[PDB]
């Protein structure tokens, strides 16, 4: 289940804070700051 919506509920946000669930809606922005192994996998996938 890949949840990429932006308007998460209050309970959902608390789940993100408590590490209960991963926050995947600003991950492409986070991978662009590090630009590490995970990003280069997406760089190659898009290039291919």
| Least distance to a second copy, CB of residue 39, Å | 13
CA distance linking residue 41 with residue 7, whole number of Å: 28
Give min distance, CB of 5 to a second copy, in A: 15
Q: How far apart, in whole angstroms, are the C-alpha atoms of residue 29 and residue 41?
A: 15
Cβ distance to a second copy smaller for residue 36 or 44: 36
Stretch 1-48 residues interacting with a second copy (CB under 8 A): 1, 10, 14, 18-20
Task: Give me the residue label for tokens 């289940």.
Answer: 1
Q: Which residues bind a second copy (CB under 8 A)?
A: 1, 10, 14, 18-20
């Amino acid at each position: 289940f890949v949840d990429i919506g932006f308007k998460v509920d209050s309970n959902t946000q608390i789940a993100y804070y408590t590490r209960e669930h991963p926050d995947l809606r600003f991950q492409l922005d986070a991978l662009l700051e590090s630009q590490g192994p995970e990003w280069t996998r997406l760089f190659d996938l898009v290039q291919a």
